[PDB]
Amino acid sequence: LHGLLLDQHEEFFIKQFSLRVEILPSYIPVRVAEKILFVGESVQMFEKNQEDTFAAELHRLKQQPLFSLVDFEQVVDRIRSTVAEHLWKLMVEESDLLGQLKIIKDFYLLGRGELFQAFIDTAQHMLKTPPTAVTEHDVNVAFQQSAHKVLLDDDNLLPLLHLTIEYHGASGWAALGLSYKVQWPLHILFTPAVLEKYNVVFKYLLSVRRVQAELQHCWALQMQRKHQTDAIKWRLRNHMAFLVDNLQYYLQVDVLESQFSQLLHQINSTRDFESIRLAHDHFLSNLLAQSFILLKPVFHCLNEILDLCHSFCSLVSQNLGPLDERGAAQLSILVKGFSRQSSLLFKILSNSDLAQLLLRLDYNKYYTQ
Amino acid sequence: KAAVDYFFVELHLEAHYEALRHFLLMEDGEFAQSLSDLLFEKLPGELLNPLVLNSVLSKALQCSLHGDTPHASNLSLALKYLPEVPDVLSCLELRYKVDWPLNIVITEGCSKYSGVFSFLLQLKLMMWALKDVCFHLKRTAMAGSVQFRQLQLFKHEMQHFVKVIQGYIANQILHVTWCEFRARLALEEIQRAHAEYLHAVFRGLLTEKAAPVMNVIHSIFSLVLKFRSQLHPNFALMQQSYNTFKYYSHFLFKVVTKLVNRQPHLEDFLLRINFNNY
Amino acid sequence: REIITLQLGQCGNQIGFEFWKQLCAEHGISPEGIVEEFTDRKDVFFYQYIPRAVLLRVIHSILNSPYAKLYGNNWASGFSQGEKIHEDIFDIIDREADGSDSLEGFVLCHSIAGGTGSGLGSYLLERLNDRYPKKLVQTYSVFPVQPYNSLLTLKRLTQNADCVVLDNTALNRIATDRLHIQSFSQINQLVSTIMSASTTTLRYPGYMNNDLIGLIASLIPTPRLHFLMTGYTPLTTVLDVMRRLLQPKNVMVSNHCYIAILNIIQGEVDPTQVHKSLQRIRERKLANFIPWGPASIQVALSRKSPYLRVSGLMMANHTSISSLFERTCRQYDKLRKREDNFDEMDTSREIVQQLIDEYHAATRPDYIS
Amino acid sequence: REIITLQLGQCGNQIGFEFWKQLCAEHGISPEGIVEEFTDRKDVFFYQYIPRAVLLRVIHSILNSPYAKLYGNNWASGFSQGEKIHEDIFDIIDREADGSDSLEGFVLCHSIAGGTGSGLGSYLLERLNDRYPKKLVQTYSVFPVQPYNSLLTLKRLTQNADCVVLDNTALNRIATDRLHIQSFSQINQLVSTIMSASTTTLRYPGYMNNDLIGLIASLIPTPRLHFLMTGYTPLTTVLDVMRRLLQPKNVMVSNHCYIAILNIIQGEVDPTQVHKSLQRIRERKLANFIPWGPASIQVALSRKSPYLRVSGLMMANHTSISSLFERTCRQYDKLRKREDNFDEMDTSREIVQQLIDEYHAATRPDYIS
């Protein structure tokens, strides 16, 4: 109830605080020990009638001539549920979490994708080169030129977004990232741990966005190039590389807008705050699990498909004539690997892939593969 | 709460701030345009005794059309150096004065106004001397030839650079830095809030951090003064001067750009100096 | 990335105004082109508010409406006029292009049957490909001496317009059965609904589909197969709306199989059960597909205008659309044997023969080569 | 520094009257020239209140107005009458000149549409350069045998007046559109508004531009290119004002680029965003400037009359003003072939054709030399 621990010899089992197990009593279960560690830190960080009455309860236990654990919890859990109810009141109503989560979904998870296709359109040449000590500022301006380019005018939450360049510990895109200076109230909900797994999603989701925006520009040229019996192999490969990518870019609006719609529903349901720290935590773990980022085999096979399109799209853009000067000689290289990589993936999916493989197999084309 | 309230509703702390700005920071026109205009009419032993400079102020306040209040007094127009003898420097201070219950808040060091003042006055020396050559050439008008029209285009090309650097100052040190500290106030805080309002010296390019940006300004201001000396017997002597002006200005645009990577205040400068050019 | 819209002919200028009064109503835009108080990205169609329109007798009818501040009959006759006002209109078009930041496409509304459309619409498509070569030109053309104007125009739309047909016969039919009208002023109400929902995903910030390329590239695989069809069901779950799309009783049309499907949902349906709906559709096998190439069925979500319940629009690429061409070209041959060079109308019949051939050959297991 | 006005012809005496009404309304000055009870320096225009007016038929009705206590058709005939009263009228000017402390300029309100004042305007400017060579003169001329009287006064205005054009044609377009008049006293309501706000920085003290030479010296680059146009948007933040000013729908005028702009804001708007609006105008590239010298746009703030909402004035020097002259002089050549020496009309046509050459030469990247 006072957030401080009166101790100068490391006696009590608590020593940003932590918990102690090598000194914790025997008959006390760890479950209530965790409950104690939370009910206090929620006061020390936080800096009426809900204060004195509990003091009478604790004092009452001191009169009991026999330590009854079955009662020790009925006083702890009420204290726990009261501060949790009091904390949820602030973490949602006073300090609006919905507005803040709405910011994270837009920028971290590419929710506002329309801002990034312009930022990619501008800050492109300055990242294919290896990174140096100056590129960190060369992009923060381009990102700032972007938000104004989409008529988004808001001096709030604009300087809070600072792109980072992991330099000196190599293509520039591989080190790109976005950090977020969190405010004071949500400092407990968004630790450097949870705010890091978010970044990994932004790294991957941007890549698929980069290759897709790149790939379709080539289509904007093939159709444009309407005025060779072998040049037609391009679109017969482009569309193959398109459907696998575009629909892979689906299941994303239906894993984000579906997992998110649960995370927001678990919030407005439980008056308790302890659920939010777990509902949000499970929401994050699902994205790493559903989006196949943790599944190594698929993530190490589709990755080959990613950089594969970079080569093909460049091949069509690096010229304006038919594929004769060893381009066709380079063209048939990838199809022997791509189509091999294509059906290689097919055996992998044959829990969560059911939502994905269904879309690619709508016409049973891979069934003929 | 009763201590702070005692200051506003009884001793007019809100008035003193919005009054010293009228006089020191030269916000009130028809006063700087009348003080600087008088002093610049003269230019040694003259213009230094308390009979002219201690009296030019009492002649200036009459042409202010704003003031002549108990606040308007206590404008000691003193000096801090004895000049011996084309440059852009004329050292002269202008110190406000207060009494006991207000002296404890407005620090005797917050001396820094005198730091930002001598710059702002130096700026007026351009818009008057440059106005002179614009007015000195008017009486020359029959005399229409390539040597004439090509000459006047230099003034329009040099004036615009001063009329844009001034428009910057009239935006940072008088309006946006005044938006803060006016909607910020509404006893210890008054000391720090004031120490944060003036600390006007950061957006004013007077800080030693961005000092190289200020050093280049003198090269610009100096060449305009030389342009005033040659009020077409020596046209080519002036043609070389303008070409030096176009080089230094073209060098400023690069030194400010290189200093963007390392200050959001300077960001608005490049948008001012550069607009549809490089 | 903005889209400049052009409107030609009486039918084109009429549908556009009804498309404009519909669009500005979905937003908080007063008829005086001023925002009313009362997130919705409005930059794609409006310039900072003015719509990026170029309208080309009926103009008087538009300026008499309270929306005033919003801004012969032979094929040979229409074309001759075009070359005479060649320079006059392009300065109107060019100045709008330079005014836009990054112009992307060209929406055109015109009717092949309409004389002015059959004369002036055809001329622009050749000039538009000449001046600006890297800009897509998509048209909302609408099928109805009458066969002549139609086939001569189709000769241009198959090589110039890289991308939707609206048949008045089916529209007049739908008017009787489910609307019970019997005029032009009533059927246009439903026309505006199609064009509006066609560009829903662009006017609201989403995850993908943030450009006109984001919709068309998945539909058109080859420069020849570039004809689409629309379907508007509501005249409630996600599985409910799809079963009404595939019924030919609502598609405005009069072996055969599709190429790719794009589904647009404007409701607030739970996005979790959409993957359940697709599974039952593949089980029922309600639509036939192509076996040669990989294709999939797509679906997208958006938000209805709040200032104005589930709607639905589908984009279909069917080979049955070739029959409508045959009917027209059949009547063309009928008038050819009954009645300066008379040669241009001869080559036009030959080039459209390739188009109908490409679709009839597309429904074979050996469409390639 | 005091300013004095002169009003000639029927037009100048009319708009100057309403100019005196609106200005007298800004300050707490009763119609009877007496201050009522109810900061603003009222000494530049008023002299202890007495306005420094000089009025040269309608004058009878002017004294019949409640503001009484506030004080042929050819060009050569208008020039002759000015010579017959050379000394008689001039005494009023002199006695008002040195009786004033320090004269700064001479505001001239007159019309050039064939009136006796139009010639009367030509004469005064010749003598104003004769007697006082150190006194600026500004004139708010207004544009419509009418070609004759118009082109002649242009010969004097280009070498005497060191500095605002207003064409009735572009004014009436504003009248029918946003006031719906379908009169003379109706359009001048807006005209007086332009002049009133034109001297907002003079009657109210500010930091920059505290004198009539403070406004003109920046815009006019050479004594020849000395023509200005105006803009007045309120008929809401800073980005709303400047964007509505640059539109050709608001300009009071019937390649091409700007030389200098001046925007006067009269509201209490938040000055923190004035730099942001400057960024968005640059990036969208909504206006085009000269290529040779660095040309910018300047803005200054002031305060409205507290007795009487965000207003704004736009002052510009656009080389498109050359087109207006071409409309005039073209009519002259047509009237030159259709109808004591007729030699003055020659040099007049000669000198303006030098000016029309001077504008067209300013738009080239090599205007120097």
Tab-separated table of N, CA and C in Angstrom, chain D residues 116-162:
chain	number	residue	atom	x	y	z
D	116	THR	N	-13.592	62.542	-68.191
D	116	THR	CA	-12.855	63.823	-68.061
D	116	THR	C	-11.792	63.590	-66.989
D	117	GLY	N	-12.117	62.841	-65.918
D	117	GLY	CA	-11.011	62.597	-64.971
D	117	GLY	C	-9.870	61.819	-65.609
D	118	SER	N	-10.147	60.850	-66.498
D	118	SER	CA	-9.066	60.054	-67.153
D	118	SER	C	-7.992	60.985	-67.734
D	119	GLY	N	-8.395	62.054	-68.432
D	119	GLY	CA	-7.399	63.030	-68.916
D	119	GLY	C	-6.854	63.781	-67.715
D	120	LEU	N	-7.772	64.268	-66.874
D	120	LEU	CA	-7.473	64.940	-65.616
D	120	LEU	C	-6.469	64.141	-64.794
D	121	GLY	N	-6.521	62.812	-64.889
D	121	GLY	CA	-5.516	61.999	-64.228
D	121	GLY	C	-4.166	62.084	-64.914
D	122	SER	N	-4.171	62.190	-66.243
D	122	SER	CA	-2.919	62.270	-66.983
D	122	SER	C	-2.169	63.557	-66.666
D	123	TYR	N	-2.903	64.652	-66.462
D	123	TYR	CA	-2.252	65.936	-66.232
D	123	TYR	C	-1.598	65.993	-64.858
D	124	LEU	N	-2.330	65.591	-63.815
D	124	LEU	CA	-1.823	65.724	-62.454
D	124	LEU	C	-0.506	64.985	-62.269
D	125	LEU	N	-0.376	63.802	-62.871
D	125	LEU	CA	0.840	63.016	-62.683
D	125	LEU	C	2.044	63.696	-63.318
D	126	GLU	N	1.835	64.420	-64.418
D	126	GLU	CA	2.932	65.169	-65.017
D	126	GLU	C	3.428	66.252	-64.069
D	127	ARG	N	2.504	66.988	-63.452
D	127	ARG	CA	2.899	68.062	-62.553
D	127	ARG	C	3.405	67.526	-61.222
D	128	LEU	N	2.855	66.403	-60.754
D	128	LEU	CA	3.320	65.830	-59.495
D	128	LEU	C	4.785	65.424	-59.583
D	129	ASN	N	5.247	65.047	-60.775
D	129	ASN	CA	6.671	64.784	-60.958
D	129	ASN	C	7.445	66.074	-61.178
D	130	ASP	N	6.756	67.148	-61.564
D	130	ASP	CA	7.423	68.430	-61.779
D	130	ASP	C	7.745	69.109	-60.454
D	131	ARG	N	6.728	69.317	-59.617
D	131	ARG	CA	6.909	70.076	-58.384
D	131	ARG	C	7.636	69.257	-57.320
D	132	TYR	N	7.067	68.115	-56.937
D	132	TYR	CA	7.627	67.299	-55.868
D	132	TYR	C	8.359	66.108	-56.467
D	133	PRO	N	9.681	66.111	-56.511
D	133	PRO	CA	10.395	64.961	-57.074
D	133	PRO	C	10.723	63.904	-56.030
D	134	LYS	N	10.446	64.200	-54.760
D	134	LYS	CA	10.753	63.292	-53.662
D	134	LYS	C	9.495	62.712	-53.026
D	135	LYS	N	8.381	62.696	-53.751
D	135	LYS	CA	7.109	62.220	-53.220
D	135	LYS	C	6.601	61.069	-54.076
D	136	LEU	N	6.492	59.894	-53.467
D	136	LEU	CA	5.925	58.740	-54.144
D	136	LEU	C	4.477	59.023	-54.528
D	137	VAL	N	4.004	58.349	-55.571
D	137	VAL	CA	2.613	58.443	-55.995
D	137	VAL	C	2.103	57.036	-56.290
D	138	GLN	N	0.986	56.670	-55.677
D	138	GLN	CA	0.317	55.405	-55.932
D	138	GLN	C	-1.072	55.673	-56.496
D	139	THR	N	-1.506	54.818	-57.415
D	139	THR	CA	-2.775	55.029	-58.099
D	139	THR	C	-3.519	53.706	-58.191
D	140	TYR	N	-4.785	53.721	-57.778
D	140	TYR	CA	-5.664	52.555	-57.879
D	140	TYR	C	-6.567	52.694	-59.103
D	141	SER	N	-5.936	52.699	-60.272
D	141	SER	CA	-6.675	52.835	-61.518
D	141	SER	C	-7.624	51.660	-61.709
D	142	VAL	N	-8.657	51.879	-62.516
D	142	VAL	CA	-9.655	50.861	-62.816
D	142	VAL	C	-9.868	50.839	-64.324
D	143	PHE	N	-9.947	49.626	-64.898
D	143	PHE	CA	-10.053	49.383	-66.329
D	143	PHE	C	-11.494	49.059	-66.718
D	144	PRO	N	-11.872	49.267	-67.989
D	144	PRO	CA	-13.247	49.002	-68.427
D	144	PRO	C	-13.617	47.524	-68.381
D	145	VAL	N	-14.416	54.623	-78.657
D	145	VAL	CA	-13.462	55.636	-78.225
D	145	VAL	C	-12.825	55.223	-76.905
D	146	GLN	N	-13.422	54.221	-76.261
D	146	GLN	CA	-12.849	53.681	-75.030
D	146	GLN	C	-11.434	53.147	-75.219
D	147	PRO	N	-11.074	52.511	-76.343
D	147	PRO	CA	-9.657	52.156	-76.536
D	147	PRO	C	-8.730	53.359	-76.530
D	148	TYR	N	-9.171	54.487	-77.088
D	148	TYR	CA	-8.323	55.674	-77.153
D	148	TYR	C	-7.918	56.139	-75.760
D	149	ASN	N	-8.903	56.594	-74.980
D	149	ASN	CA	-8.636	57.158	-73.627
D	149	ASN	C	-7.916	56.151	-72.718
D	150	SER	N	-8.081	54.847	-72.958
D	150	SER	CA	-7.415	53.848	-72.133
D	150	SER	C	-5.925	53.773	-72.449
D	151	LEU	N	-5.578	53.649	-73.733
D	151	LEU	CA	-4.178	53.449	-74.090
D	151	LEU	C	-3.354	54.712	-73.874
D	152	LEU	N	-3.989	55.882	-73.927
D	152	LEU	CA	-3.242	57.126	-73.772
D	152	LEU	C	-2.729	57.289	-72.346
D	153	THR	N	-3.611	57.159	-71.355
D	153	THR	CA	-3.196	57.346	-69.968
D	153	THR	C	-2.146	56.323	-69.558
D	154	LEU	N	-2.087	55.195	-70.266
D	154	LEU	CA	-1.043	54.215	-69.993
D	154	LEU	C	0.335	54.775	-70.311
D	155	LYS	N	0.408	55.736	-71.237
D	155	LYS	CA	1.694	56.337	-71.580
D	155	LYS	C	2.243	57.161	-70.422
D	156	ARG	N	1.360	57.799	-69.653
D	156	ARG	CA	1.790	58.585	-68.503
D	156	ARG	C	1.999	57.735	-67.258
D	157	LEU	N	1.171	56.711	-67.053
D	157	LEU	CA	1.247	55.885	-65.856
D	157	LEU	C	2.496	55.021	-65.806
D	158	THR	N	3.134	54.765	-66.944
D	158	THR	CA	4.305	53.899	-66.973
D	158	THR	C	5.605	54.635	-66.689
D	159	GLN	N	5.566	55.952	-66.493
D	159	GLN	CA	6.797	56.704	-66.275
D	159	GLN	C	6.666	57.700	-65.132
D	160	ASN	N	5.440	57.936	-64.663
D	160	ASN	CA	5.231	58.835	-63.532
D	160	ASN	C	4.863	58.072	-62.264
D	161	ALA	N	3.825	57.246	-62.333
D	161	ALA	CA	3.401	56.472	-61.172
D	161	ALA	C	4.428	55.388	-60.872
D	162	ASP	N	5.054	55.478	-59.701
D	162	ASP	CA	6.032	54.488	-59.289
D	162	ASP	C	5.389	53.190	-58.834
